[PDB]
Design a protein around this ligand. Sequence first.
Ligand SMILES: *[C@@H]1O[C@H](CO)[C@@H](O[C@@H]2O[C@H](CO)[C@@H](O[C@@H]3O[C@H](CO)[C@@H](O)[C@H](O)[C@@H]3O)[C@H](O)[C@H]2NC(C)=O)[C@H](O)[C@H]1NC(C)=O
Ligand SMILES: *[C@@H]1O[C@H](CO)[C@@H](O[C@@H]2O[C@H](CO)[C@@H](O[C@@H]3O[C@H](CO)[C@@H](O)[C@H](O)[C@@H]3O)[C@H](O)[C@H]2NC(C)=O)[C@H](O)[C@H]1NC(C)=O
Ligand SMILES: *[C@@H]1O[C@H](CO)[C@@H](O[C@@H]2O[C@H](CO)[C@@H](O[C@@H]3O[C@H](CO)[C@@H](O)[C@H](O)[C@@H]3O)[C@H](O)[C@H]2NC(C)=O)[C@H](O)[C@H]1NC(C)=O
Ligand SMILES: *[C@@H]1O[C@H](CO)[C@@H](O[C@@H]2O[C@H](CO)[C@@H](O[C@@H]3O[C@H](CO)[C@@H](O)[C@H](O)[C@@H]3O)[C@H](O)[C@H]2NC(C)=O)[C@H](O)[C@H]1NC(C)=O
Ligand SMILES: *[C@@H]1O[C@H](CO)[C@@H](O[C@@H]2O[C@H](CO)[C@@H](O)[C@H](O)[C@H]2NC(C)=O)[C@H](O)[C@H]1NC(C)=O
Ligand SMILES: *[C@@H]1O[C@H](CO)[C@@H](O[C@@H]2O[C@H](CO)[C@@H](O)[C@H](O)[C@H]2NC(C)=O)[C@H](O)[C@H]1NC(C)=O
Ligand SMILES: *[C@@H]1O[C@H](CO)[C@@H](O[C@@H]2O[C@H](CO)[C@@H](O)[C@H](O)[C@H]2NC(C)=O)[C@H](O)[C@H]1NC(C)=O
Ligand SMILES: *[C@@H]1O[C@H](CO)[C@@H](O[C@@H]2O[C@H](CO)[C@@H](O)[C@H](O)[C@H]2NC(C)=O)[C@H](O)[C@H]1NC(C)=O
Ligand SMILES: *[C@@H]1O[C@H](CO)[C@@H](O[C@@H]2O[C@H](CO)[C@@H](O)[C@H](O)[C@H]2NC(C)=O)[C@H](O)[C@H]1NC(C)=O
Ligand SMILES: *[C@@H]1O[C@H](CO)[C@@H](O[C@@H]2O[C@H](CO)[C@@H](O)[C@H](O)[C@H]2NC(C)=O)[C@H](O)[C@H]1NC(C)=O
Ligand SMILES: *[C@@H]1O[C@H](CO)[C@@H](O[C@@H]2O[C@H](CO)[C@@H](O)[C@H](O)[C@H]2NC(C)=O)[C@H](O)[C@H]1NC(C)=O
Ligand SMILES: *[C@@H]1O[C@H](CO)[C@@H](O)[C@H](O)[C@H]1NC(C)=O
Ligand SMILES: *[C@@H]1O[C@H](CO)[C@@H](O)[C@H](O)[C@H]1NC(C)=O
Ligand SMILES: *[C@@H]1O[C@H](CO)[C@@H](O)[C@H](O)[C@H]1NC(C)=O
Ligand SMILES: *[C@@H]1O[C@H](CO)[C@@H](O)[C@H](O)[C@H]1NC(C)=O
Ligand SMILES: *[C@@H]1O[C@H](CO)[C@@H](O)[C@H](O)[C@H]1NC(C)=O
Ligand SMILES: *[C@@H]1O[C@H](CO)[C@@H](O)[C@H](O)[C@H]1NC(C)=O
Lengths: 488, 488, 488
Amino acid sequence: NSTATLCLGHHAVPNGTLVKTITNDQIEVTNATELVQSSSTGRICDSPHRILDGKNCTLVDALLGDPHCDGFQNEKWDLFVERSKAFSNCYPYDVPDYASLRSLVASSGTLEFINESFNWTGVTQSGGSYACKRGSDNSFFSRLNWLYESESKYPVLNVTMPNNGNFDKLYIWGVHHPSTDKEQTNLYVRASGRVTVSTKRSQQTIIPNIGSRPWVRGLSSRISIYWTIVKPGDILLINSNGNLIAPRGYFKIRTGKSSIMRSDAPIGTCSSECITPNGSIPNDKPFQNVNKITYGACPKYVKQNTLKLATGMRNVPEKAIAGFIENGWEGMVDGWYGFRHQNSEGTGQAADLKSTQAAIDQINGKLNRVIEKTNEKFHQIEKEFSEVEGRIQDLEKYVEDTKIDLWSYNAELLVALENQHTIDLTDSEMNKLFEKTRRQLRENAEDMGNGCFKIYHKCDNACIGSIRNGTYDHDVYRDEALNNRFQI
Amino acid sequence: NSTATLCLGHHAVPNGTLVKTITNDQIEVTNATELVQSSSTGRICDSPHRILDGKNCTLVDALLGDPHCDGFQNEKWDLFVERSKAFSNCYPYDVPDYASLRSLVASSGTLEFINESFNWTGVTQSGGSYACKRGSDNSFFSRLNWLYESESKYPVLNVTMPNNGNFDKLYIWGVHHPSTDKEQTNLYVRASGRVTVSTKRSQQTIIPNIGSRPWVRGLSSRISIYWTIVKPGDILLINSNGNLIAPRGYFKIRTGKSSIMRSDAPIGTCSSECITPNGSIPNDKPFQNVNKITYGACPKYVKQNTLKLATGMRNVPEKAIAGFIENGWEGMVDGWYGFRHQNSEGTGQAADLKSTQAAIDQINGKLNRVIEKTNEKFHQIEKEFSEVEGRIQDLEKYVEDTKIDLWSYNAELLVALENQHTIDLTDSEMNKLFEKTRRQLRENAEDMGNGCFKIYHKCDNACIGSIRNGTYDHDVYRDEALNNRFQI
Amino acid sequence: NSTATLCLGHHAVPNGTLVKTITNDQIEVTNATELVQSSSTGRICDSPHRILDGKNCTLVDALLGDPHCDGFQNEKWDLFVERSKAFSNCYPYDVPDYASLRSLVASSGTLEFINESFNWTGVTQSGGSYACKRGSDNSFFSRLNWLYESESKYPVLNVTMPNNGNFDKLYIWGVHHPSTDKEQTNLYVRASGRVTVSTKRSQQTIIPNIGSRPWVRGLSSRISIYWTIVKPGDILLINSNGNLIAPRGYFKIRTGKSSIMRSDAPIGTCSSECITPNGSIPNDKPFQNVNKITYGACPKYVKQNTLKLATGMRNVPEKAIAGFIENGWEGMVDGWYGFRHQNSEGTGQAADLKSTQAAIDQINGKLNRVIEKTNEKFHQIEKEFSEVEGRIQDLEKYVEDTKIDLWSYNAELLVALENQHTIDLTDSEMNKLFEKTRRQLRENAEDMGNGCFKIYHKCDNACIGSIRNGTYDHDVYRDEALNNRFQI
Ligand SMILES: *[C@@H]1O[C@H](CO)[C@@H](O[C@@H]2O[C@H](CO)[C@@H](O[C@@H]3O[C@H](CO)[C@@H](O)[C@H](O)[C@@H]3O)[C@H](O)[C@H]2NC(C)=O)[C@H](O)[C@H]1NC(C)=O
Ligand SMILES: *[C@@H]1O[C@H](CO)[C@@H](O[C@@H]2O[C@H](CO)[C@@H](O[C@@H]3O[C@H](CO)[C@@H](O)[C@H](O)[C@@H]3O)[C@H](O)[C@H]2NC(C)=O)[C@H](O)[C@H]1NC(C)=O
Ligand SMILES: *[C@@H]1O[C@H](CO)[C@@H](O[C@@H]2O[C@H](CO)[C@@H](O[C@@H]3O[C@H](CO)[C@@H](O)[C@H](O)[C@@H]3O)[C@H](O)[C@H]2NC(C)=O)[C@H](O)[C@H]1NC(C)=O
Ligand SMILES: *[C@@H]1O[C@H](CO)[C@@H](O[C@@H]2O[C@H](CO)[C@@H](O[C@@H]3O[C@H](CO)[C@@H](O)[C@H](O)[C@@H]3O)[C@H](O)[C@H]2NC(C)=O)[C@H](O)[C@H]1NC(C)=O
Ligand SMILES: *[C@@H]1O[C@H](CO)[C@@H](O[C@@H]2O[C@H](CO)[C@@H](O)[C@H](O)[C@H]2NC(C)=O)[C@H](O)[C@H]1NC(C)=O
Ligand SMILES: *[C@@H]1O[C@H](CO)[C@@H](O[C@@H]2O[C@H](CO)[C@@H](O)[C@H](O)[C@H]2NC(C)=O)[C@H](O)[C@H]1NC(C)=O
Ligand SMILES: *[C@@H]1O[C@H](CO)[C@@H](O[C@@H]2O[C@H](CO)[C@@H](O)[C@H](O)[C@H]2NC(C)=O)[C@H](O)[C@H]1NC(C)=O
Ligand SMILES: *[C@@H]1O[C@H](CO)[C@@H](O[C@@H]2O[C@H](CO)[C@@H](O)[C@H](O)[C@H]2NC(C)=O)[C@H](O)[C@H]1NC(C)=O
Ligand SMILES: *[C@@H]1O[C@H](CO)[C@@H](O[C@@H]2O[C@H](CO)[C@@H](O)[C@H](O)[C@H]2NC(C)=O)[C@H](O)[C@H]1NC(C)=O
Ligand SMILES: *[C@@H]1O[C@H](CO)[C@@H](O[C@@H]2O[C@H](CO)[C@@H](O)[C@H](O)[C@H]2NC(C)=O)[C@H](O)[C@H]1NC(C)=O
Ligand SMILES: *[C@@H]1O[C@H](CO)[C@@H](O[C@@H]2O[C@H](CO)[C@@H](O)[C@H](O)[C@H]2NC(C)=O)[C@H](O)[C@H]1NC(C)=O
Ligand SMILES: *[C@@H]1O[C@H](CO)[C@@H](O)[C@H](O)[C@H]1NC(C)=O
Ligand SMILES: *[C@@H]1O[C@H](CO)[C@@H](O)[C@H](O)[C@H]1NC(C)=O
Ligand SMILES: *[C@@H]1O[C@H](CO)[C@@H](O)[C@H](O)[C@H]1NC(C)=O
Ligand SMILES: *[C@@H]1O[C@H](CO)[C@@H](O)[C@H](O)[C@H]1NC(C)=O
Ligand SMILES: *[C@@H]1O[C@H](CO)[C@@H](O)[C@H](O)[C@H]1NC(C)=O
Ligand SMILES: *[C@@H]1O[C@H](CO)[C@@H](O)[C@H](O)[C@H]1NC(C)=O
């Protein structure tokens, strides 16, 4: 006698996308999203961090007071940007452990300088050189004081400067290395000099070395740069019989979030939390392949250039109606799961809202349950190097390589696990909907094996509606259905 | 009347607790346990490790033999505890690479010192100073020998000490830095001194520095400390024409589990494997947020202060009997899963032991399948710093920060995966029990859709017992049930 | 008979193997595979990397040109192997920061040397020593030039060498430390010498130290070794008034994949991508416990000595036919899942190929979806050390320990997760095959509860085949089966 068909199904799209799971090398899903940020605009955004463009100046030359760097006096920054075109244009110098001086100043974030009056009676102050023109005059580093003989004498200097405040003082000083003995004795009378800078807890003595170095900006002489931090209640003592390059005061040294970066990218007007030497990048994705060098709230650097996170179910092409065993339904556009029927009123279709929402709710914000937010990092270690150095650089490189391989592994496993779970939970909602419909129908229907029920009674549009609504009363139809099912 | 109802259910509690899974931001379960240790008693337990309280003494001052540290002569430790109140009270000194000498002695774990007879003929031994009082006498570091002129002469010292033993020897020696030339020549005759300590394979030469330093305990002079390790079959040679602070012998240097920690926590009578600067902590949990500085068998340091691991099923409160589709049963207190029935004898309930034990067995020891035990660590790297240093300290901080972010990621993912699996395995035990009952019943029952069966025959308490027992014989009742189901 | 029995089952084996999952401490499976490489052949394979056996020579003695290392002149390598028997046989020397010099040369991969003509007019070249015989003559390091007085004079040397090419130059030079003043003035006329080597960007000054060191190969004198790298467009300048040990030219310095390893394993004819100090190892497994020191494309080092990855389903001993609810089938040796039946023509067994392939396809290459290939590492950090050093060595050890604990955790979790997924997916294929058969049979069969169906009609060998085929037409038999099922 009289029967009807009720099929259960899920949607499908014509333009699917491939992802990887624990189970499958490649499986097509209806939708996915990229987790690796792989592009930049190429500009460093000037908000929200305070960006200071070094332009023609390294941080160290701005510290010492090279004349063409005079504009940087007493400046501050969150990120100091060093350019590849920068150059020195003052007295030729070197800094033992230059990388550490550059690092601790960059981290402090300020060039604020406070003058102090040392008692330099007995010597002449403010020596200058034609290698260090300020305007048209011979000059010198603005923060250093080149001392030399007065009236053919250089007495032994022995000078003190207490730290009577609440904060550490950073003192920058140096030692002059003459090219010849005639140069040495013309300036310091004595044939050999000595420079001792000490505190209660520390001391440094340096003896200059007389001899020719290769000509730089007209000079074979050199200055070596040193530094001393004086804690509150300690005392700076400077002791010299010649060749001392005196400080003119101290730098205020702070703690905080400041750092330094080498980059030639232009600075632009926008805001962006994450900065790389390539420019700023968005941080909406958890991973990035733009540059292992970062500043700010940044995605984690990984080796992969793409990781696709599934955001929808398996995509299965559409092969009497038929249900989910065979294929997906490209014609279902207003839900993820639903019903099709054929009965005496024709054929029709309707979406299931609840099962659709359950799948969307589980997929929404899935990655955040494991990586909630991006970590902010500020001053770190250097990661590129322009000179061969051996033991310490080997270690710096190994530390960073180790870190990147472990985060790359985490990223790969996370995406495969999460995608496996997306397939499993969207399959599971389909099955739950089918089973729920099966128990509603009791003895009034049989499973045809293709995702559909043969309903063994007349079942018009209202009857199909009551099943979708969950209000179908199997008792109303059981007598008719048993009669149809169990005849012979 | 002619039928009975049999429902399958699981327990529920009135006081559930919220956890995170791969699927859900927050889901209530019946029971959970804390995986981050976040408190301490505040005292360092004196068992099972040998604790040595430095009291007023740094390890380096106990090594050198500052008089107020004389009680530490020949001591040993598993963990040396350095107090912030410690102070020096002898000749003012510094140590180039101070951190490395503190580290290597801390790691060796002993101050065992062995006297040797160096041949100091030609000079006076045992110089002392009012800056270094031992009792009522001017004195000096007990393990060092301050040499100076005898009868207004200081010959070139040239002395040897072979290592004819089976163990490395550690020699601590020094160089005296006078304040003035009058001081220098009064002690050492020459206007300039020199100290060279060498082995077959290594050498160190130090030239003293004459000049004024700030007064510490009455003195502007200083000593610098140096060290030399001599291997079996090697030879120590000490060569000096002035300013040498000689060793009196060597320290035995061992390898093993000893270390050093900065802490102001009191030492108490108790036992604990894990020590932090805050006090000892339990190690029953896998992670801790008390301090990244630890010694012994310790939980792993993470940034989270709470991680909740589910130890029970989803909690669904109890809102005609009904089964697990609707809700959980708070009235079920002797098992996790069970049966309720309604029949001609009224209503009853009983727990299923086998499904209950299977869920408990899977949850028991769950975390230990991945992290079995806690790692024991001894001497590590420093992780707090009182001075600005630049490159090397940047690297130490970055190594530790990298480590903590990776373990913190591991802890978050592990708790999310494990909790998802606890929900899944406990849902699965409920489903398996329902299906097993479904198949026992054959054609004698229908599923009502709510976790219950309508049994289509008289089924008294003994009859319900036979289903729970697994001994129900469907054939005994089939005729009666088919007649009631199909009215045939 | 008027009925038949069709059971569904999976295979089992008599020799199972134990593995660990997220759920089970130990569960027996049909097959597993070892993921930790723990053995080696003990020989270093000479393909595909260029191996250079140091034999009696350290890399550094081969660089300087110790006469018994003359054979290594201008040599090159991918991996330089240093032997524990190596010895020095020339002038006794030391290298401040020896480890960095060894590291940067090992990394460069070449001893290619280019003689340059320095202007030493005014002094005598090519000093030699009976501690350094070449043949029967007193001699010296081949790449160094021992300068000394000519005609009782030693003028101040001031000598230049530009880099006018496109590649960096590495210069090795030294300073002679005499034992006595008579030696010093006999060689260099002056009572004290000094050596300054400088570029536009750097300077190094070393003052020699006169005094006795312990006798080595007849001499209490020593040479100290130093190095300088010169960039294109820079200039080397050597300035000395005595004690200079001059370079004879430069070493070409390259970048690439080269390194150095300490090992006493013999070199043999074979190929292997991965080298350890124990010998070469296979790299087909993802992890290894042979040695944390490796070179090339190697498995990752872990602490575990065994990790078993399941490659088959749960193994259940075979306890009239019965299906999968009870046990596995040891007698099914041609498939993983299958059918057993009893019907009017007898009893039989047949494998189901499609479900067997689905499980095998999912297990095949499962580990590669997460760790696709082996990482190639070349020059890294040192990981064993023969001298006590303190801070830097503490950090090298801690970096390596940290890495190994994180990877050992990654390995443990991966194996437990994957094994859980292998159990789950093979359980699932069995269930899917049972449900597929249930739905083919419609009203013609009942589930007996033990993994078998009672089919309520005559069902000969062809009929059973149509069920295994997916082509069974339930309508053909429905009248006969309903009559048999339903009767009072
Ligand atoms: C030791 O040797 C070096 C180099 O052999 C001498 O340095 C050289 O000094 C001369 C004159 O002082 C420099 O010449 C100048 O060159 C510039 C630029 O081309 C030009 O503007 C001048 O008019 C003059 O010709 C030469 O550049 C410089 N070479 C180097 C490499 O620095 C040094 O003077 C010698 N020292 C002693 C004490 O003899
Ligand atoms: C180089 O300059 C320093 C700094 O001015 C001189 O140091 C000072 O030396 C005097 C003694 O000559 C010390 O004074 C003493 O103070 C204590 C009280 O705390 C007092 O009882 C003593 O009776 C005397 O007043 C003073 O503390 C010290 N200051 C510092 C910072 O070291 C040093 O003497 C000069 N050296 C030469 C060689 O000229
Ligand atoms: C290599 O180094 C030597 C040593 O400095 C250089 O030789 C010296 O060269 C100068 C200039 O050619 C000579 O000066 C000349 O001396 C004669 C009389 O001695 C004088 O009449 C000339 O007017 C000029 O002053 C100097 O004598 C000579 N010294 C020696 C010991 O030979 C040589 O130039 C350097 N080679 C190169 C390519 O630069
Ligand atoms: C400073 O003291 C050292 C330590 O005693 C002196 O070194 C010793 O010097 C003697 C003679 O110069 C060396 O003697 C030789 O020993 C070898 C080894 O068997 C033997 O074959 C020779 O025939 C000769 O007897 C002795 O080895 C050496 N010992 C060491 C450890 O270097 C050094 O001479 C003293 N310096 C001065 C300037 O007096
Ligand atoms: C395909 O997946 C993406 C990623 O989840 C969906 O885009 C999200 O849409 C919601 C609501 O519109 C936004 O709140 C998210 O910010 C979007 N995420 C991204 C990364 O764009 C997208 O809607 C899905 N497409 C379809 C047709 O459902
Ligand atoms: C950075 O330095 C360059 C080099 O000195 C400067 O460029 C010169 O500027 C002067 C003054 O305007 C001109 O006379 C020269 O012709 C320029 N030379 C070149 C090669 O361009 C430049 O002005 C500096 N920039 C900043 C921002 O300070
Ligand atoms: C961002 O900048 C980095 C640094 O220069 C780029 O990396 C270089 O890429 C070139 C060619 O792609 C290689 O030859 C270099 O070896 C790379 N250098 C380093 C240090 O890796 C990178 O490609 C840039 N990325 C983007 C997205 O602009
Ligand atoms: C809630 O979960 C905790 C954690 O598993 C249970 O505590 C365990 O109880 C057993 C028996 O009392 C002890 O042997 C274990 O050592 C305990 N483990 C921990 C971590 O404390 C607790 O029993 C559970 N509560 C209920 C009501 O089931
Ligand atoms: C254990 O000791 C550490 C170190 O003192 C404590 O960490 C400090 O906590 C205070 C208060 O939150 C902060 O202001 C400091 O900046 C922290 N110092 C460091 C170095 O992190 C920690 O709170 C203590 N923990 C317990 C449980 O007592
Ligand atoms: C047991 O498992 C191992 C590991 O998967 C199987 O060995 C693989 O067999 C295939 C085909 O013979 C080869 O291509 C692979 O190279 C083998 N891998 C390893 C690691 O040996 C083995 O076939 C399985 N044994 C049985 C009886 O099923
Ligand atoms: C590979 O070589 C290393 C280094 O010798 C071996 O590790 C040593 O193992 C012995 C075991 O008798 C220990 O006593 C040593 O302390 C270990 N040394 C180090 C540095 O770890 C390792 O066992 C060897 N492995 C194989 C498979 O040959
Ligand atoms: C498929 O095309 C639609 C329509 O343009 C688009 O909205 C959707 O994001 C696409 N999805 C994929 C996975 O390409
Ligand atoms: C709930 O209360 C019981 C009764 O004392 C207690 O034993 C149990 O541990 C509590 N559990 C939670 C999650 O609060
Ligand atoms: C530590 O030093 C202070 C100050 O001299 C003293 O009063 C105290 O007794 C000392 N403590 C110990 C344990 O020696
Ligand atoms: C120490 O050396 C001197 C020679 O400088 C010698 O006379 C003396 O006997 C040696 N031994 C001693 C003093 O025990
Ligand atoms: C069991 O034995 C067979 C045949 O000898 C062998 O091929 C197989 O690898 C063994 N499996 C296990 C898990 O031992
Ligand atoms: C290494 O040195 C020993 C000792 O001189 C010598 O007998 C041997 O021949 C040398 N071997 C090689 C390979 O040079």
